């Protein structure tokens, strides 16, 4: 009745042993990049699936069952994917259970969000009615409003009660609290994670002082409600007559210089309004982008902007020669430091010598890629003679092998470099190596690198930043860092607009645009606008109804602490 | 905790509902062709595997788990198949557990018996250490001596106790008695089977008067011990200096005009002596067969034989135009009957008109194949005008659509046809359609068709029949029929030699040649020869040790019945 993992070493896992109870709803949590993903998927799921299919770096796994993953890793349509040939009767019910009743059967699978695709996959799997299976789920709350949280949990417990084991990788409060058993992975992330910090009932995890997760679940840590909301400064964008998909001829004003959250249940029209209409219309007017925007009459207030930038979880680059140091430009500052050493000068090495993208200093066998690791440079990317030049006893490959946090100390006497490294540290990437290849960064890591570069950029207040569900993949502690960074962009007078369901984010927003009231044909209207406090009071707003008790909970936690 | 099958219709299954308890050793039994195979494999295993792989004619199946089959349906070697690169340490132990410790790691997988291949597959599967799996096993006792029966049962119960369900298709007494739950399928076979006759504990099945299986388990029915053993009549074959594989320079005499059983544990040298040496040497001397015989000095007594015939479970033909009626030649007798009808005469139809193998009377669209069923003849194989000729109101396609037993009644006034049909009835194929295509016959069916044709053949007493494990696939009631037929061949003065582990067969033998004492390097010697009673007394003979209590059990049952 237990899955026994012994000596798990995948990625950053530190040769760990873990017991997971079978026939239970088990949640694995931790920071983004803690190793929770390596444990659930690269280790447990991979081994369980491999063993059945016969018909990962680990010593032994005992008590495995044949495993099925439910993630986004899987022109067809909704109808073809669920084999069903607006939401024969059996399947349709499962689509409703996973919160997808607003989808049409004709919908291109290629145009579903990742959260939608994941939930179609979940529906198909519930349809199988299998027992004795080990299900491994990645973050099933993605794309789901707090209102649908209870039904998701009930759906998971129903699969469990059929006689299956559920391993759920999550950061969502309610899911963790509803778990049979909860495992906190990683003190930190990467090199700083990969350990079992705490394991037991949610209640036992809350009472464990070592557990970062337990400290947030118990209230010892929380994201505060901001003292004041920023007020509009007279600059508005206005979307006029938005009609794309289910949007009911919507007009709405967006205040610049504020942190704006677009909210609403799944299928309410959030992504249509923001991605299909606003982003595409702005990108076409501002950057001459090709993509045809969704149906709308007009967008006013374009005189206020120079640029629109969507920050998503797509890669920062396509080669190993791209990394966090090259993306932020801290790489070029480092090359300048090496070029300024006595030994570089004596040898006549200019900055170009310390670039792995040009002939001279790079390893010529791998053209500076490092890669199987190149037999010549062993992945260091530079030839032997270049590597003899050191700054403070370190060569350029050793520098690129430093974590952001160690590089911060190492470059303490170079302000320009410090300032760039601080942005990466502040976004939550202190653990990451400067030279980590773009090809190996997770989605969340890539979004955070991009945010770090934006934070550094000189601002004129004329940029609109758009982020579609940026809390995807993030622990509440990661979210605190994300919010710190996003609010700092707004302080420059730029505008941050997020599509979110996460109430930790929403409660810190200056301004909310709530769509609905429901999804599909029953959505596409503006339900409420205003501050979190204003939306909290609107009875017809599902977002408000769930937001109100969060504002109250976290105001009370603030007032309890002032009682110091 | 139950697998619920509702409305199963595969092959001969008669729209049945069945409950199978989960986490148990469940045995499905019945006659050969009862439908037990259609239930376990075509229905339960197929659905369980299909459902997992997404990641059969049946209404619904509830409580399925991902399913793994253990049969013979799966140049590589023992080493490569178990991935192991005489019986790293983990796997070797499993090969011992399944009774394969005499195998070498270099052995060609292509030269393993079906029973050996099945047990390698079983070993690999135990190696997986999976839980929550539904295992479906076809006849795992194939090739296994009674001595290894207890260990096989312990091995199965160990897989169950790991937390799996075992559905075992079997006819073996001890396996049935050791079952948690036992299901008796089919009153008869084919059209006469496909129903759940009895289901419960083995004890409950024994106490059910409807159950053919229970009647044999309880002793109400049994195969008797013959009154007298046939004595040699002066004709002997002698194998001289057999050295192939593990055979220790063996010389042994075989008495013709008797029923001979070659016995011994797995790997003792049975198939080497009989198939590799005896059969190949005789086939080369008598029929100029090409295959090089195994190493031996000589074979004496060839003056006594005209032919050697191996009867196995390979197909009777390769096309649909081959069937039990064509193989036995009863087809040609039927064509004669049609050619003799008034209407055939009036029309000038000769016997050739009623052959689907020649132009004129056959359906020309499918060249007489019947096949998707041909859109023209609808599978009847003949054109419209031929089908207008009837005998006793039936046309030739209707005759071919008759079961052997119905055809027996229908042709009651044609002795020649009756005599051929009786052979098929006597081998146990009363249920089978005369025209059933060779391409659709099971292994056991094909062997039985061949035996029927042999039984009909005029004999000079100069044939040696060899059968390698002919009880494969057979219920003890099927075995009684098989033995009746084989003993009738011996009555003609021909010789029947079987390789067997089945003690129901062995106890009826006139003469036993027992190899061993163990398998592999520890086998290859003649342990004992003589009557069953003589071998029963030999302490060093594993065959004798298990045979003795069977002779006693069944002699006592005979004496109890005489107390009528
Ligand atoms: N490409 C498309 N084709 C057809 N219908 C779509 C498409 N994209 C979105 N919709 C429909 O429009 C409605 C709003 O969808 P969406 O904007 O994705 O909601 P949200 O982003 O708030 O979850 C939904 O009912 C959805 O089924
Ligand atoms: N083709 C082969 N190559 C190597 N060894 C073999 C081959 N066939 C049989 N043997 C070995 O000879 C011994 C006797 O095998 P076999 O005659 O198949 O035993 P039985 O038929 O009694 O089970 C076994 O130990 C087996 O491993
Ligand atoms: Zn190189
Ligand atoms: Zn035809």
B326 sits in which H/E element: helix B324-328
The CB density around residue A300, as the number of other CB atoms within 10 Å, is 13
Query: How long, in residues, is chain B?
Result: 564
* Contact predicate B402/B298, CB 8 Å: no
Which letter does DSSP use for residue A38 in this model?
A: I
Domain that holds residue B137: 2-218
Q: How far apart are the first and last CA of chain A?
A: 47
* Contact predicate A527/A517, CB 8 Å: yes
Which letter does DSSP use for residue B312 in this model?
A: -
Q: How far is CA B559 from CA A38, B225, B226, B563, in A?
A: 71, 11, 13, 7
**Cα B514 from Cα B541, distance rounded (Å):** 7
* Contact predicate A95/A118, CB 8 Å: no
From B38's Cα to the closest Cα of chain A, the distance in A is 20
Q: In Å, how far from its chain's centre is CA B561?
A: 30
Q: Strands across the sheet with B67-70, in order?
A: B67-70, B134-138, B165-169, B25-29, B181-185, B196-200
> How many angstroms separate the alpha carbon of residue B417 from the centre of ligand 1?
74
B133: chain A residues, CB-CB within 8 Å: 52, 65-66, 132
Neighbours of ion ligand 3 (CB under 5 A): A 363, 365-366, 374, 376-377
**Cα B548 from Cα B507, distance rounded (Å):** 9
Nearest to B503 by CA among B547, B553, B552: B547
SS (H, E, C) B463-475: EEEEEECCCCCCC
Side-chain half-sphere of B347: how many Cα atoms within 13 Å?
20
**Cα B30 from Cα A255, distance rounded (Å):** 79
> How many angstroms separate the alpha carbon of residue B107 from the centre of ligand 2?
9
State the DSSP string of A309-349: EE--SS-S-SSTT--HHHHHTHHHHHHHHHHTSHHHHHHT-
Of A51, A125, A129, the CB nearest to B55: A125
Cβ contact, residue pair B132, A65, below 8 Å: yes
**Cα B493 from Cα B66, distance rounded (Å):** 53
Q: Strands across the sheet with A2-8, in order?
A: A16-21, A2-8, A60-62
Q: Which bin fits B505, alpha (ψ -120 to 50), beta or left (φ > 0)?
A: alpha
Q: Which of A24, A67, A132, A162 to mutate to test the interface with B (most CBs of B within 10 A)?
A: A132
A539 sits in which H/E element: none
> How many angstroms separate the alpha carbon of residue B243 from the centre of ligand 2?
12
**Cα B334 from Cα A554, distance rounded (Å):** 94
Q: Which bin fits A66, alpha (ψ -120 to 50), beta or left (φ > 0)?
A: beta
Any idea what the Cα angle at residue B164 is, between residues B159 and B166, rounded to 5°? 75
* Contact predicate B309/B454, CB 8 Å: yes
**Sign of dihedral through CA atoms B42, B48, B53, B59?**
positive
Of B125, B129, B132, the CB nearest to A132: B132
State the DSSP string of A457-496: S---S-EEEEEESTTTT--HHHHHHHHHHHHHHHHTT-EE
Residue A111 in contact with partner chain B when CB distance is under 8 A: no
A297 sits in which H/E element: none
Neighbours of ion ligand 4 (CB under 5 A): B 363, 365-366, 374, 376-377
A526 sits in which H/E element: strand A525-530
* Contact predicate B510/B230, CB 8 Å: yes
Unique residue bearing structure tokens 């106790």? B161
**Cα A113 from Cα A101, distance rounded (Å):** 15
Asked if omega into B517 is within 30° of 0 (cis), the reply is yes
From B541's Cα to the closest Cα of chain A, the distance in A is 38
Cβ contact, residue pair B130, A64, below 8 Å: yes
Q: How far is CA A93 from CA A100, A408, B60, B62, B349, in A?
A: 10, 54, 18, 18, 64
State the DSSP string of B375-429: TTTTT--B-HHHHT--BTTB-HHHHHTSBHHHHHHHTTT-HHHHHHHHHHHHHT-
In Å, what resolution does this model reach?
2.1
Q: How far is CA A67 from CA A135, B26, B108, in A?
A: 6, 25, 33
Q: How far is CA B348 from CA B339, B377, B382, in A?
A: 9, 22, 16
* Contact predicate B363/B370, CB 8 Å: yes
Side-chain half-sphere of A354: how many Cα atoms within 13 Å?
30
Residue A72 in contact with partner chain B when CB distance is under 8 A: no
SS (H, E, C) A189-226: CHHHCCCEEEEECHHHHHCCCCCHHHHHHHCCCCCCCC
Residues 112 through 171 of chain B touching chain A, CB cutoff 8 Å: 124-125, 128-134
**Cα A489 from Cα A505, distance rounded (Å):** 15
Which letter does DSSP use for residue A359 in this model?
A: T
Neighbouring residues of A145: CB distance < 8 A, sequence distance ≥ 6: A264, A265, A266, A501, A542, A543, A546
> How many angstroms separate the alpha carbon of residue B383 from the centre of ligand 4?
7
The CB density around residue A530, as the number of other CB atoms within 10 Å, is 17
A450 in ligand 1 pocket by Cβ < 6 Å? Answer: no
Report residue B429 as tokens: 């194929």
Torsion of CA B338, B339, B342, B348, to 10 degrees: 140
* Contact predicate B6/B60, CB 8 Å: yes
Report residue B454 as tokens: 């042999």
Nearest to B337 by CA among B433, B415, B404, B453: B415
Of B22, B52, B130, the CB nearest to A130: B52
Report residue B140 as tokens: 């795992």
Side-chain half-sphere of B55: how many Cα atoms within 13 Å?
30
Q: Which bin fits A39, alpha (ψ -120 to 50), beta or left (φ > 0)?
A: alpha
**Which residue(s) pair with A198 in the sheet?**
A184
Report residue A173 as tokens: 């409060």
Report residue B7 as tokens: 């409305």
* Contact predicate B188/B207, CB 8 Å: no
**Cα B519 from Cα A64, distance rounded (Å):** 35
**Cα A71 from Cα A64, distance rounded (Å):** 20
Unique residue bearing structure tokens 């009880």? B471
We report the CATH number of the domain holding residue A213 as: 3.40.50.300
Report residue B379 as tokens: 């599978």
Q: Which of A52, A124, A137, A160 to mutate to test the interface with B (most CBs of B within 10 A)?
A: A52
3 state SS of A307: strand
Residue A6 in contact with partner chain B when CB distance is under 8 A: no
Nearest to A239 by CA among A279, A287, A298: A298
Neighbouring residues of B344: CB distance < 8 A, sequence distance ≥ 6: B338, B350, B353, B354, B389
């Amino acid at each position: 009745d237990k899955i026994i993992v012994k000596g798990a070493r995948a990625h950053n896992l530190k040769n760990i042993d873990v017991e997971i109870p079978r026939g239970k709803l088990v949640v694995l949590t931790g920071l983004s990049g803690s190793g929770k993903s390596s444990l659930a998927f690269d280790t447990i799921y991979a081994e369980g699936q491999r063993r059945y299919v016969e018909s990962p770096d680990v010593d032994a796994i005992e008590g495995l069952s044949p495993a099925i993953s439910i993630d986004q890793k899987t022109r067809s349509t909704v109808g073809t994917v669920t084999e069903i040939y607006s939401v024969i009767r059996d399947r349709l019910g499962f689509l409703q259970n996973v919160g997808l009743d607003y989808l049409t059967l004709s919908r291109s699978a290629g145009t579903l969000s990742g959260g939608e695709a994941q939930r179609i996959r979940l529906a198909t799997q519930i349809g199988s009615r299998l027992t004795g299976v080990l299900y491994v789920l990645d973050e099933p709350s993605i794309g789901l409003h707090q209102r649908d949280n209870d039904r998701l949990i009930a759906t998971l417990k129903s699969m469990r009660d059929l006689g299956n084991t559920l391993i759920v990788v999550e950061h969502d409060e309610d899911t963790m609290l509803a778990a049979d058993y909860l495992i906190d992975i990683g003190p930190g992330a990467g090199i700083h994670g990969g350990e079992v910090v705490a394991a037991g009932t949610p209640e036992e995890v809350m009472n464990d002082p070592n557990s970062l997760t337990g400290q947030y679940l118990s209230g010892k840590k929380f994201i505060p409600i901001p003292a004041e909301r920023r007020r509009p400064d007279g600059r508005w964008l206005e979307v006029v007559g938005a009609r794309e998909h289910n949007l009911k001829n919507v007009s709405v004003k967006i205040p610049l210089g504020t942190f704006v959250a677009v909210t609403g249940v799944s299928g309410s029209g959030k992504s249509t309004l923001v991605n299909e209409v606003l982003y595409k219309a702005l990108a076409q007017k501002l950057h001459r982008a090709k993509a045809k925007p969704g149906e709308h009459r007009d967008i006013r207030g374009l005189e206020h902007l120079d640029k629109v930038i969507d920050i998503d979880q797509s890669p920062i680059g396509r080669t190993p020669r791209s990394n966090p140091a090259t993306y932020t430009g801290v790489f070029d500052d480092i090359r300048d430091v090496f070029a300024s050493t006595n030994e570089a000068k004596v040898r006549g090495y200019k900055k170009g010598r310390f670039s792995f993208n040009v002939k001279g200093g790079r390893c010529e066998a791998c053209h500076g890629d490092g890669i199987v690791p190149c037999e010549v440079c062993h992945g260091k990317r530079y030839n032997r003679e270049t590597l003899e030049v050191t700054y403070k006893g370190k060569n350029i490959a050793e520098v690129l092998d430093m974590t952001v946090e160690d590089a911060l100390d190492f470059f303490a006497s170079i302000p320009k470099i410090k300032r760039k490294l601080e942005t990466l540290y502040d976004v939550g990437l202190g653990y990451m190596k400067l030279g980590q290849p773009a090809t190996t960064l997770s989605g969340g890591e890539a979004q955070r690198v991009k945010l770090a570069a934006e934070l550094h950029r000189r601002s004129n207040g004329r940029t609109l930043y758009i982020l579609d569900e940026p809390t995807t993949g993030l622990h509440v502690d990661d979210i605190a860092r994300l919010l710190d960074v996003l609010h700092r962009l707004v302080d420059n007078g730029d505008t941050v607009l997020v599509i979110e369901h996460n109430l930790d984010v929403i409660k810190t927003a200056d301004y909310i645009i709530d769509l609905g009231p429901e999804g599909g044909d029953r959505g596409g209207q503006i339900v409420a606008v205003g501050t979190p406090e204003e939306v909290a009071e609107v009875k017809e707003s599902h977002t408000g109804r769930y937001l109100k008790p969060i504002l109250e909970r976290d105001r009370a936690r603030m007032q309890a602490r002032y009682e110091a």
